[PDB]
Amino acid sequence: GPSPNLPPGFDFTDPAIYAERLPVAEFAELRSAAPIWWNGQDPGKGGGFHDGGFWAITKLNDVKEISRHSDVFSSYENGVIPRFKNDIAREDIEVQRFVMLNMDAPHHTRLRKIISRGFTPRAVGRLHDELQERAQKIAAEAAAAGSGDFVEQVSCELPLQAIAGLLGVPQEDRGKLFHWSNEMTGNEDPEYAHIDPKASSAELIGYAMKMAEEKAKNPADDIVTQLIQADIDGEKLSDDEFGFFVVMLAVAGNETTRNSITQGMMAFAEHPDQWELYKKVRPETAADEIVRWATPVTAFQRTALRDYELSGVQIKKGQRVVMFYRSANFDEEVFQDPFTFNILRNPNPHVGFGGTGAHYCIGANLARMTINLIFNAVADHMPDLKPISAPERLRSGWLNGIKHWQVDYTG
Ligand X SMILES: CCOC(=O)c1cc2cc(-c3ccncc3)ccc2n1CCN1CCOCC1
- 183 with 197: CB under 8 angstroms? yes
Q: Min. distance of Cβ 403 from ligand X in angstroms?
A: 16
**Residue choice 53, 253, 391, 401 for contact with ligand HEM (CB under 6 A):** 253
The verdict on 154 binding ligand X (CB under 6 A) reads: no
The verdict on 335 binding ligand X (CB under 6 A) reads: no
In this chain, which residue has its C-beta nearest to ligand HEM? 363
Is 318 labelled a binding residue? no
Q: Residue 391: name its binding partner from ligand X, ligand HEM, none (Cβ under 5 to 8 Å by kind).
A: none
**Residue choice 128, 337, 360, 388 for contact with ligand HEM (CB under 6 A):** 360
Q: Min. distance of Cβ 206 from ligand HEM in angstroms?
A: 20
The verdict on 374 binding ligand HEM (CB under 6 A) reads: no
Q: Min. distance of Cβ 256 from ligand HEM in angstroms?
A: 4
What is the C-alpha separation between 100 and 112, in angstroms, rounded? 7
The verdict on 394 binding ligand HEM (CB under 6 A) reads: no
The verdict on 101 binding ligand X (CB under 6 A) reads: yes
Q: Min. distance of Cβ 117 from ligand HEM in angstroms?
A: 13
The verdict on 70 binding ligand HEM (CB under 6 A) reads: no
3-class secondary structure for the chain? CCCCCCCCCCCCCCHHHHCCCCCHHHHHHHHHHCCEEEEECCCCCCCCCCCCEEEEECCHHHHHHHHHCCCCEECCCCCCCCCCCCCCCHHHHHHHHHCHHHCCCCHHHHHHHHHHHHHCHHHHHCCHHHHHHHHHHHHHHHHHCCEEEHHHHHHCHHHHHHHHHHHCCCHHHHHHHHHHHHCCCCCCCHHHCCCCHHHHHHHHHHHHHHHHHHHHHCCCCCCHHHHCCCCCCCCCCCHHHHHHHHHHHHHHCCHHHHHHHHHHHHHHHHCHHHHHHHHHHCCCHHHHHHHHHHCCECEEEEEECCCEEECCEEECCCCEEEEEHHHHCCCCCCCCCCCCCCCCCCCCCCCCCCCCCCCCCCCHHHHHHHHHHHHHHHHHHCCCCEECCCCEECCCCCECCEEECEEECCC
What is the C-alpha separation between 306 and 320, in angstroms, rounded? 11
Q: Min. distance of Cβ 193 from ligand HEM in angstroms?
A: 25
| Angle 368-195-142 from CA coordinates, rounded to 5° | 45
Q: Is the Cβ of residue 302 or residue 381 nearer to ligand HEM in the bound state?
A: 302
The verdict on 249 binding ligand HEM (CB under 6 A) reads: yes
The verdict on 301 binding ligand X (CB under 6 A) reads: no
Q: Is the Cβ of residue 95 or residue 334 nearer to ligand X in the bound state?
A: 95
Amino acid at the residue 104: D
**Residue choice 260, 298, 348, 396 for contact with ligand HEM (CB under 6 A):** 260
The verdict on 187 binding ligand X (CB under 6 A) reads: yes
**Residue choice 165, 186, 355, 401 for contact with ligand HEM (CB under 6 A):** 355
**Residue choice 60, 101, 267, 385 for contact with ligand HEM (CB under 6 A):** 101
Q: Residue 251: name its binding partner from ligand X, ligand HEM, none (Cβ under 5 to 8 Å by kind).
A: ligand X
Is 186 labelled a binding residue? yes
The verdict on 99 binding ligand X (CB under 6 A) reads: yes
Q: Min. distance of Cβ 281 from ligand X in angstroms?
A: 31
Q: Residue 98: name its binding partner from ligand HEM, ligand X, none (Cβ under 5 to 8 Å by kind).
A: ligand X
Where is the binding site for substrate, in residues? 186
Query: What residues make contact with ligand X under the rule CB under 6 A?
Result: 81, 84, 92, 95-96, 98-99, 101, 184-185, 187, 197, 201, 247-248, 251-252, 256, 297
